[PDB]
Amino acid sequence: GGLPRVADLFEARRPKEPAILAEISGIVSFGKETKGKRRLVITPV
DNA sequence: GCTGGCACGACTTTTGCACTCTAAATAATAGATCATGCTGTTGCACA
């Protein structure tokens, strides 16, 4: 908090752990060829 | 007759053209903070 955060909000800095969002139809797909790169490749049709 | 500022022939001064030739020693440490580009590392798909 504090107020080196008014500066952060106006500078539009991204946070360290952003929340990932989805699109119009986020059907459950879990993983799709995840392998080494990341994990749980979601494929909402 | 006495005196006080003007010119002249040596001398003197100025001026471009002209090319020159070691070790010491001084400060770091003690702002972070963020953005961006370059380079090496690794996961992924192909013949």
Side-chain angles (χ1 to χ4, degrees), chain A residues 1-2 4-29 31 34 36 40-44:
Chain A
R5 185 186 204 279
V6 178
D8 267 359
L9 286 164
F10 281 135
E11 286 298 325
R13 298 201 209 290
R14 317 192 73 251
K16 303 318 316 153
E17 208 260 314
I20 51 196
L21 321 180
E23 274 75 8
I24 298 286
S25 175
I27 318 179
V28 46
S29 179
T34 80
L40 268 166
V41 174
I42 295 207
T43 312

PDB file of all heavy atoms in Angstrom, chain A residues 7-42, unseen atoms left out:
ATOM      1  N   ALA A   7       1.771   6.251  -7.755  1.00  0.00           N
ATOM      2  CA  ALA A   7       2.697   6.250  -8.880  1.00  0.00           C
ATOM      3  C   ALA A   7       2.621   4.942  -9.658  1.00  0.00           C
ATOM      4  O   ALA A   7       2.639   4.946 -10.892  1.00  0.00           O
ATOM      5  CB  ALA A   7       4.121   6.499  -8.384  1.00  0.00           C
ATOM      6  N   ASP A   8       2.536   3.810  -8.953  1.00  0.00           N
ATOM      7  CA  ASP A   8       2.472   2.517  -9.628  1.00  0.00           C
ATOM      8  C   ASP A   8       1.211   2.389 -10.471  1.00  0.00           C
ATOM      9  O   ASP A   8       1.248   1.844 -11.579  1.00  0.00           O
ATOM     10  CB  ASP A   8       2.541   1.385  -8.606  1.00  0.00           C
ATOM     11  CG  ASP A   8       3.954   0.898  -8.370  1.00  0.00           C
ATOM     12  OD1 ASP A   8       4.884   1.428  -9.014  1.00  0.00           O
ATOM     13  OD2 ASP A   8       4.137  -0.020  -7.544  1.00  0.00           O
ATOM     14  N   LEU A   9       0.077   2.867  -9.954  1.00  0.00           N
ATOM     15  CA  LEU A   9      -1.171   2.795 -10.706  1.00  0.00           C
ATOM     16  C   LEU A   9      -1.130   3.685 -11.941  1.00  0.00           C
ATOM     17  O   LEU A   9      -1.620   3.300 -13.008  1.00  0.00           O
ATOM     18  CB  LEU A   9      -2.345   3.185  -9.813  1.00  0.00           C
ATOM     19  CG  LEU A   9      -2.783   2.166  -8.766  1.00  0.00           C
ATOM     20  CD1 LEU A   9      -3.658   2.838  -7.731  1.00  0.00           C
ATOM     21  CD2 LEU A   9      -3.520   1.020  -9.425  1.00  0.00           C
ATOM     22  N   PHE A  10      -0.564   4.887 -11.813  1.00  0.00           N
ATOM     23  CA  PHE A  10      -0.524   5.804 -12.945  1.00  0.00           C
ATOM     24  C   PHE A  10       0.545   5.411 -13.954  1.00  0.00           C
ATOM     25  O   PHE A  10       0.411   5.712 -15.144  1.00  0.00           O
ATOM     26  CB  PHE A  10      -0.307   7.234 -12.453  1.00  0.00           C
ATOM     27  CG  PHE A  10      -1.551   7.883 -11.919  1.00  0.00           C
ATOM     28  CD1 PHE A  10      -1.523   8.601 -10.738  1.00  0.00           C
ATOM     29  CD2 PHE A  10      -2.749   7.771 -12.596  1.00  0.00           C
ATOM     30  CE1 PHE A  10      -2.665   9.197 -10.247  1.00  0.00           C
ATOM     31  CE2 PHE A  10      -3.894   8.365 -12.107  1.00  0.00           C
ATOM     32  CZ  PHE A  10      -3.851   9.078 -10.932  1.00  0.00           C
ATOM     33  N   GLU A  11       1.603   4.735 -13.508  1.00  0.00           N
ATOM     34  CA  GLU A  11       2.612   4.221 -14.423  1.00  0.00           C
ATOM     35  C   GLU A  11       2.180   2.935 -15.109  1.00  0.00           C
ATOM     36  O   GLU A  11       2.894   2.458 -15.996  1.00  0.00           O
ATOM     37  CB  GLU A  11       3.930   3.986 -13.684  1.00  0.00           C
ATOM     38  CG  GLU A  11       4.685   5.253 -13.329  1.00  0.00           C
ATOM     39  CD  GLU A  11       5.099   6.057 -14.543  1.00  0.00           C
ATOM     40  OE1 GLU A  11       5.430   5.450 -15.582  1.00  0.00           O
ATOM     41  OE2 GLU A  11       5.101   7.301 -14.456  1.00  0.00           O
ATOM     42  N   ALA A  12       1.038   2.367 -14.716  1.00  0.00           N
ATOM     43  CA  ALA A  12       0.474   1.170 -15.342  1.00  0.00           C
ATOM     44  C   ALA A  12       1.451   0.000 -15.304  1.00  0.00           C
ATOM     45  O   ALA A  12       1.564  -0.769 -16.259  1.00  0.00           O
ATOM     46  CB  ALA A  12       0.024   1.458 -16.776  1.00  0.00           C
ATOM     47  N   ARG A  13       2.159  -0.141 -14.188  1.00  0.00           N
ATOM     48  CA  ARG A  13       3.111  -1.229 -14.026  1.00  0.00           C
ATOM     49  C   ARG A  13       2.375  -2.543 -13.802  1.00  0.00           C
ATOM     50  O   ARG A  13       1.376  -2.590 -13.080  1.00  0.00           O
ATOM     51  CB  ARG A  13       4.051  -0.943 -12.859  1.00  0.00           C
ATOM     52  CG  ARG A  13       4.892   0.296 -13.054  1.00  0.00           C
ATOM     53  CD  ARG A  13       6.126   0.265 -12.179  1.00  0.00           C
ATOM     54  NE  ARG A  13       6.579   1.603 -11.819  1.00  0.00           N
ATOM     55  CZ  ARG A  13       7.133   2.464 -12.661  1.00  0.00           C
ATOM     56  NH1 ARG A  13       7.332   2.158 -13.933  1.00  0.00           N
ATOM     57  NH2 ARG A  13       7.503   3.661 -12.215  1.00  0.00           N
ATOM     58  N   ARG A  14       2.867  -3.607 -14.432  1.00  0.00           N
ATOM     59  CA  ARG A  14       2.278  -4.919 -14.245  1.00  0.00           C
ATOM     60  C   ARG A  14       2.731  -5.526 -12.918  1.00  0.00           C
ATOM     61  O   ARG A  14       3.861  -5.301 -12.476  1.00  0.00           O
ATOM     62  CB  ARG A  14       2.660  -5.846 -15.394  1.00  0.00           C
ATOM     63  CG  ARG A  14       2.589  -5.196 -16.764  1.00  0.00           C
ATOM     64  CD  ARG A  14       2.683  -6.235 -17.866  1.00  0.00           C
ATOM     65  NE  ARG A  14       1.456  -7.014 -17.987  1.00  0.00           N
ATOM     66  CZ  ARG A  14       1.340  -8.290 -17.645  1.00  0.00           C
ATOM     67  NH1 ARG A  14       2.359  -8.967 -17.143  1.00  0.00           N
ATOM     68  NH2 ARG A  14       0.171  -8.902 -17.811  1.00  0.00           N
ATOM     69  N   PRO A  15       1.870  -6.293 -12.264  1.00  0.00           N
ATOM     70  CA  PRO A  15       2.242  -6.949 -11.007  1.00  0.00           C
ATOM     71  C   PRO A  15       3.116  -8.171 -11.268  1.00  0.00           C
ATOM     72  O   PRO A  15       3.282  -8.622 -12.399  1.00  0.00           O
ATOM     73  CB  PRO A  15       0.892  -7.343 -10.408  1.00  0.00           C
ATOM     74  CG  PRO A  15       0.001  -7.502 -11.581  1.00  0.00           C
ATOM     75  CD  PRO A  15       0.453  -6.506 -12.603  1.00  0.00           C
ATOM     76  N   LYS A  16       3.674  -8.712 -10.181  1.00  0.00           N
ATOM     77  CA  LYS A  16       4.574  -9.856 -10.304  1.00  0.00           C
ATOM     78  C   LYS A  16       3.808 -11.131 -10.638  1.00  0.00           C
ATOM     79  O   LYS A  16       4.315 -11.987 -11.374  1.00  0.00           O
ATOM     80  CB  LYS A  16       5.376 -10.042  -9.013  1.00  0.00           C
ATOM     81  CG  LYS A  16       6.224  -8.850  -8.543  1.00  0.00           C
ATOM     82  CD  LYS A  16       7.014  -8.075  -9.610  1.00  0.00           C
ATOM     83  CE  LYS A  16       7.751  -8.944 -10.625  1.00  0.00           C
ATOM     84  NZ  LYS A  16       7.923  -8.229 -11.919  1.00  0.00           N
ATOM     85  N   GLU A  17       2.591 -11.277 -10.109  1.00  0.00           N
ATOM     86  CA  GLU A  17       1.772 -12.475 -10.298  1.00  0.00           C
ATOM     87  C   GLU A  17       0.408 -12.057 -10.829  1.00  0.00           C
ATOM     88  O   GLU A  17      -0.578 -12.014 -10.081  1.00  0.00           O
ATOM     89  CB  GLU A  17       1.632 -13.260  -8.991  1.00  0.00           C
ATOM     90  CG  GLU A  17       1.424 -14.760  -9.173  1.00  0.00           C
ATOM     91  CD  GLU A  17      -0.022 -15.176  -9.023  1.00  0.00           C
ATOM     92  OE1 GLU A  17      -0.674 -14.732  -8.059  1.00  0.00           O
ATOM     93  OE2 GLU A  17      -0.510 -15.961  -9.859  1.00  0.00           O
ATOM     94  N   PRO A  18       0.314 -11.737 -12.117  1.00  0.00           N
ATOM     95  CA  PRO A  18      -0.981 -11.340 -12.678  1.00  0.00           C
ATOM     96  C   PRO A  18      -1.948 -12.510 -12.721  1.00  0.00           C
ATOM     97  O   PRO A  18      -1.554 -13.676 -12.786  1.00  0.00           O
ATOM     98  CB  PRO A  18      -0.644 -10.849 -14.092  1.00  0.00           C
ATOM     99  CG  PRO A  18       0.823 -10.966 -14.254  1.00  0.00           C
ATOM    100  CD  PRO A  18       1.399 -11.720 -13.111  1.00  0.00           C
ATOM    101  N   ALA A  19      -3.234 -12.179 -12.671  1.00  0.00           N
ATOM    102  CA  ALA A  19      -4.299 -13.163 -12.793  1.00  0.00           C
ATOM    103  C   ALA A  19      -4.648 -13.357 -14.262  1.00  0.00           C
ATOM    104  O   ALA A  19      -4.962 -12.390 -14.963  1.00  0.00           O
ATOM    105  CB  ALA A  19      -5.530 -12.717 -12.008  1.00  0.00           C
ATOM    106  N   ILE A  20      -4.595 -14.599 -14.725  1.00  0.00           N
ATOM    107  CA  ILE A  20      -4.918 -14.894 -16.116  1.00  0.00           C
ATOM    108  C   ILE A  20      -6.428 -14.967 -16.276  1.00  0.00           C
ATOM    109  O   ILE A  20      -7.136 -15.523 -15.429  1.00  0.00           O
ATOM    110  CB  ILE A  20      -4.239 -16.197 -16.573  1.00  0.00           C
ATOM    111  CG1 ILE A  20      -4.527 -17.329 -15.590  1.00  0.00           C
ATOM    112  CG2 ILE A  20      -2.739 -15.987 -16.725  1.00  0.00           C
ATOM    113  CD1 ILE A  20      -3.608 -18.518 -15.744  1.00  0.00           C
ATOM    114  N   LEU A  21      -6.928 -14.390 -17.362  1.00  0.00           N
ATOM    115  CA  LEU A  21      -8.349 -14.375 -17.668  1.00  0.00           C
ATOM    116  C   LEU A  21      -8.605 -15.191 -18.928  1.00  0.00           C
ATOM    117  O   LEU A  21      -7.681 -15.707 -19.561  1.00  0.00           O
ATOM    118  CB  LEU A  21      -8.863 -12.939 -17.832  1.00  0.00           C
ATOM    119  CG  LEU A  21      -8.299 -11.891 -16.866  1.00  0.00           C
ATOM    120  CD1 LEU A  21      -8.896 -10.523 -17.143  1.00  0.00           C
ATOM    121  CD2 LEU A  21      -8.546 -12.292 -15.422  1.00  0.00           C
ATOM    122  N   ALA A  22      -9.876 -15.302 -19.293  1.00  0.00           N
ATOM    123  CA  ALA A  22     -10.289 -16.187 -20.376  1.00  0.00           C
ATOM    124  C   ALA A  22     -11.108 -15.401 -21.398  1.00  0.00           C
ATOM    125  O   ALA A  22     -11.176 -14.167 -21.378  1.00  0.00           O
ATOM    126  CB  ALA A  22     -11.056 -17.389 -19.812  1.00  0.00           C
ATOM    127  N   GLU A  23     -11.734 -16.126 -22.320  1.00  0.00           N
ATOM    128  CA  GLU A  23     -12.515 -15.565 -23.414  1.00  0.00           C
ATOM    129  C   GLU A  23     -13.972 -16.020 -23.296  1.00  0.00           C
ATOM    130  O   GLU A  23     -14.380 -16.607 -22.289  1.00  0.00           O
ATOM    131  CB  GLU A  23     -11.891 -15.939 -24.760  1.00  0.00           C
ATOM    132  CG  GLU A  23     -10.792 -14.977 -25.204  1.00  0.00           C
ATOM    133  CD  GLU A  23      -9.488 -15.160 -24.444  1.00  0.00           C
ATOM    134  OE1 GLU A  23      -9.370 -16.132 -23.671  1.00  0.00           O
ATOM    135  OE2 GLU A  23      -8.579 -14.321 -24.615  1.00  0.00           O
ATOM    136  N   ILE A  24     -14.754 -15.739 -24.344  1.00  0.00           N
ATOM    137  CA  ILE A  24     -16.214 -15.794 -24.265  1.00  0.00           C
ATOM    138  C   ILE A  24     -16.714 -17.151 -23.791  1.00  0.00           C
ATOM    139  O   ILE A  24     -17.660 -17.229 -22.998  1.00  0.00           O
ATOM    140  CB  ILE A  24     -16.829 -15.420 -25.630  1.00  0.00           C
ATOM    141  CG1 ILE A  24     -16.458 -13.984 -26.009  1.00  0.00           C
ATOM    142  CG2 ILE A  24     -18.342 -15.586 -25.604  1.00  0.00           C
ATOM    143  CD1 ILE A  24     -17.213 -12.931 -25.225  1.00  0.00           C
ATOM    144  N   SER A  25     -16.101 -18.238 -24.259  1.00  0.00           N
ATOM    145  CA  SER A  25     -16.488 -19.591 -23.853  1.00  0.00           C
ATOM    146  C   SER A  25     -15.232 -20.340 -23.416  1.00  0.00           C
ATOM    147  O   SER A  25     -14.482 -20.857 -24.248  1.00  0.00           O
ATOM    148  CB  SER A  25     -17.219 -20.315 -24.977  1.00  0.00           C
ATOM    149  OG  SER A  25     -17.498 -21.658 -24.619  1.00  0.00           O
ATOM    150  N   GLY A  26     -15.005 -20.387 -22.106  1.00  0.00           N
ATOM    151  CA  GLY A  26     -13.876 -21.106 -21.547  1.00  0.00           C
ATOM    152  C   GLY A  26     -14.201 -22.540 -21.179  1.00  0.00           C
ATOM    153  O   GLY A  26     -14.283 -22.878 -19.994  1.00  0.00           O
ATOM    154  N   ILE A  27     -14.395 -23.392 -22.188  1.00  0.00           N
ATOM    155  CA  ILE A  27     -14.722 -24.788 -21.930  1.00  0.00           C
ATOM    156  C   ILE A  27     -13.535 -25.485 -21.282  1.00  0.00           C
ATOM    157  O   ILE A  27     -12.373 -25.131 -21.519  1.00  0.00           O
ATOM    158  CB  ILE A  27     -15.139 -25.484 -23.237  1.00  0.00           C
ATOM    159  CG1 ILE A  27     -16.042 -24.563 -24.059  1.00  0.00           C
ATOM    160  CG2 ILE A  27     -15.859 -26.791 -22.946  1.00  0.00           C
ATOM    161  CD1 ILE A  27     -16.484 -25.160 -25.377  1.00  0.00           C
ATOM    162  N   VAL A  28     -13.827 -26.487 -20.449  1.00  0.00           N
ATOM    163  CA  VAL A  28     -12.770 -27.199 -19.741  1.00  0.00           C
ATOM    164  C   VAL A  28     -11.984 -28.058 -20.720  1.00  0.00           C
ATOM    165  O   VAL A  28     -12.552 -28.851 -21.481  1.00  0.00           O
ATOM    166  CB  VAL A  28     -13.363 -28.042 -18.601  1.00  0.00           C
ATOM    167  CG1 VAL A  28     -14.577 -28.827 -19.084  1.00  0.00           C
ATOM    168  CG2 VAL A  28     -12.311 -28.981 -18.027  1.00  0.00           C
ATOM    169  N   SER A  29     -10.661 -27.889 -20.716  1.00  0.00           N
ATOM    170  CA  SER A  29      -9.786 -28.721 -21.533  1.00  0.00           C
ATOM    171  C   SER A  29      -8.533 -29.196 -20.813  1.00  0.00           C
ATOM    172  O   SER A  29      -7.814 -30.028 -21.375  1.00  0.00           O
ATOM    173  CB  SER A  29      -9.372 -27.972 -22.806  1.00  0.00           C
ATOM    174  OG  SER A  29      -8.496 -28.759 -23.594  1.00  0.00           O
ATOM    175  N   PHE A  30      -8.242 -28.702 -19.608  1.00  0.00           N
ATOM    176  CA  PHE A  30      -7.070 -29.103 -18.837  1.00  0.00           C
ATOM    177  C   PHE A  30      -5.782 -28.887 -19.622  1.00  0.00           C
ATOM    178  O   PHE A  30      -5.379 -27.744 -19.862  1.00  0.00           O
ATOM    179  CB  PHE A  30      -7.188 -30.566 -18.402  1.00  0.00           C
ATOM    180  N   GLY A  31      -5.129 -29.976 -20.020  1.00  0.00           N
ATOM    181  CA  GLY A  31      -3.873 -29.880 -20.737  1.00  0.00           C
ATOM    182  C   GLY A  31      -3.951 -30.366 -22.169  1.00  0.00           C
ATOM    183  O   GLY A  31      -4.807 -31.188 -22.510  1.00  0.00           O
ATOM    184  N   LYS A  32      -3.058 -29.859 -23.021  1.00  0.00           N
ATOM    185  CA  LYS A  32      -3.013 -30.259 -24.430  1.00  0.00           C
ATOM    186  C   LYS A  32      -1.558 -30.146 -24.890  1.00  0.00           C
ATOM    187  O   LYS A  32      -1.087 -29.059 -25.232  1.00  0.00           O
ATOM    188  CB  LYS A  32      -3.941 -29.408 -25.283  1.00  0.00           C
ATOM    189  N   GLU A  33      -0.862 -31.285 -24.896  1.00  0.00           N
ATOM    190  CA  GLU A  33       0.551 -31.349 -25.278  1.00  0.00           C
ATOM    191  C   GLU A  33       1.391 -30.389 -24.440  1.00  0.00           C
ATOM    192  O   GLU A  33       2.204 -29.621 -24.959  1.00  0.00           O
ATOM    193  CB  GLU A  33       0.730 -31.073 -26.772  1.00  0.00           C
ATOM    194  N   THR A  34       1.178 -30.426 -23.122  1.00  0.00           N
ATOM    195  CA  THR A  34       1.883 -29.512 -22.228  1.00  0.00           C
ATOM    196  C   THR A  34       3.384 -29.762 -22.251  1.00  0.00           C
ATOM    197  O   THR A  34       4.174 -28.841 -22.489  1.00  0.00           O
ATOM    198  CB  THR A  34       1.340 -29.660 -20.806  1.00  0.00           C
ATOM    199  OG1 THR A  34       1.926 -30.816 -20.192  1.00  0.00           O
ATOM    200  CG2 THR A  34      -0.169 -29.830 -20.835  1.00  0.00           C
ATOM    201  N   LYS A  35       3.793 -31.012 -22.026  1.00  0.00           N
ATOM    202  CA  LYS A  35       5.196 -31.411 -22.011  1.00  0.00           C
ATOM    203  C   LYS A  35       6.042 -30.505 -21.123  1.00  0.00           C
ATOM    204  O   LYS A  35       5.582 -30.049 -20.071  1.00  0.00           O
ATOM    205  CB  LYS A  35       5.756 -31.437 -23.434  1.00  0.00           C
ATOM    206  N   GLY A  36       7.282 -30.246 -21.541  1.00  0.00           N
ATOM    207  CA  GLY A  36       8.179 -29.444 -20.722  1.00  0.00           C
ATOM    208  C   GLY A  36       7.740 -27.997 -20.597  1.00  0.00           C
ATOM    209  O   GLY A  36       7.776 -27.417 -19.508  1.00  0.00           O
ATOM    210  N   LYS A  37       7.325 -27.392 -21.709  1.00  0.00           N
ATOM    211  CA  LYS A  37       6.990 -25.973 -21.713  1.00  0.00           C
ATOM    212  C   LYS A  37       5.727 -25.721 -20.903  1.00  0.00           C
ATOM    213  O   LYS A  37       4.644 -26.195 -21.263  1.00  0.00           O
ATOM    214  CB  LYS A  37       6.811 -25.477 -23.147  1.00  0.00           C
ATOM    215  N   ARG A  38       5.870 -24.955 -19.820  1.00  0.00           N
ATOM    216  CA  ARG A  38       4.775 -24.658 -18.903  1.00  0.00           C
ATOM    217  C   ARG A  38       4.053 -25.931 -18.482  1.00  0.00           C
ATOM    218  O   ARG A  38       4.696 -26.950 -18.208  1.00  0.00           O
ATOM    219  CB  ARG A  38       3.793 -23.674 -19.544  1.00  0.00           C
ATOM    220  N   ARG A  39       2.723 -25.884 -18.442  1.00  0.00           N
ATOM    221  CA  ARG A  39       1.898 -27.032 -18.083  1.00  0.00           C
ATOM    222  C   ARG A  39       0.439 -26.639 -18.274  1.00  0.00           C
ATOM    223  O   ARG A  39       0.096 -25.455 -18.335  1.00  0.00           O
ATOM    224  CB  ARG A  39       2.137 -27.495 -16.644  1.00  0.00           C
ATOM    225  N   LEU A  40      -0.418 -27.658 -18.366  1.00  0.00           N
ATOM    226  CA  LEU A  40      -1.865 -27.481 -18.426  1.00  0.00           C
ATOM    227  C   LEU A  40      -2.278 -26.535 -19.546  1.00  0.00           C
ATOM    228  O   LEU A  40      -2.846 -25.470 -19.286  1.00  0.00           O
ATOM    229  CB  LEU A  40      -2.389 -26.968 -17.083  1.00  0.00           C
ATOM    230  CG  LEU A  40      -2.852 -28.027 -16.079  1.00  0.00           C
ATOM    231  CD1 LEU A  40      -3.018 -27.418 -14.695  1.00  0.00           C
ATOM    232  CD2 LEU A  40      -4.145 -28.679 -16.539  1.00  0.00           C
ATOM    233  N   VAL A  41      -2.001 -26.910 -20.792  1.00  0.00           N
ATOM    234  CA  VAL A  41      -2.356 -26.092 -21.948  1.00  0.00           C
ATOM    235  C   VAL A  41      -3.868 -26.198 -22.126  1.00  0.00           C
ATOM    236  O   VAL A  41      -4.382 -27.210 -22.602  1.00  0.00           O
ATOM    237  CB  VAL A  41      -1.600 -26.525 -23.204  1.00  0.00           C
ATOM    238  CG1 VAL A  41      -2.092 -25.749 -24.415  1.00  0.00           C
ATOM    239  CG2 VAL A  41      -0.104 -26.328 -23.013  1.00  0.00           C
ATOM    240  N   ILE A  42      -4.582 -25.141 -21.738  1.00  0.00           N
ATOM    241  CA  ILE A  42      -6.038 -25.144 -21.822  1.00  0.00           C
ATOM    242  C   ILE A  42      -6.463 -24.808 -23.244  1.00  0.00           C
ATOM    243  O   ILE A  42      -5.950 -23.863 -23.858  1.00  0.00           O
ATOM    244  CB  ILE A  42      -6.636 -24.157 -20.808  1.00  0.00           C
ATOM    245  CG1 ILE A  42      -6.329 -24.615 -19.380  1.00  0.00           C
ATOM    246  CG2 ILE A  42      -8.138 -24.021 -21.017  1.00  0.00           C
ATOM    247  CD1 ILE A  42      -7.338 -24.150 -18.346  1.00  0.00           C
TER     248      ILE A  42
END
